[PDB]
Amino acid sequence: QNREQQEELMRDLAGSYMGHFMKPYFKDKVTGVGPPANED
DNA sequence: CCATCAGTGTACTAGGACCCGAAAATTGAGTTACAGAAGTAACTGGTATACTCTGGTTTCTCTTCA
Numbered sequence A: 001q002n003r004e005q006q007e008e009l010m011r012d013l014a015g016s017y018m019g020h021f022m023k024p025y026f027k028d029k030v031t032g033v034g035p036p037a038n039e040d
Numbered sequence B: 001c002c003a004t005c006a007g008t009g010t011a012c013t014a015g016g017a018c019c020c021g022a023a024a025a026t027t028g029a030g031t032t033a034c035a036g037a038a039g040t041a042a043c044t045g046g047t048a049t050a051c052t053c054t055g056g057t058t059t060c061t062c063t064t065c066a
Helices: A002-013
Strands: none
Touching: none
């Protein structure tokens, strides 16, 4: 349990926003552009 | 008295720089090739600003004819 608490502390140190999920919610991890437009 | 018309007390913008961290990219050493281009590291002339007797000059008494 204590080592799990330590690992939780470390994943807190290694945790990270909401702007990244704005208008183009989906986006490449390469280029960072959304998918093409719908037909709608 | 119901029109009108500043202020007001705020969260909600509007610019406006600015910062924090993460992730990607680079740098760096190690080897060994490869060809050629930089990149200093070296000896070796070449011509002018002082420079040092020196050749001429200049009166100034004198030398030598005349």
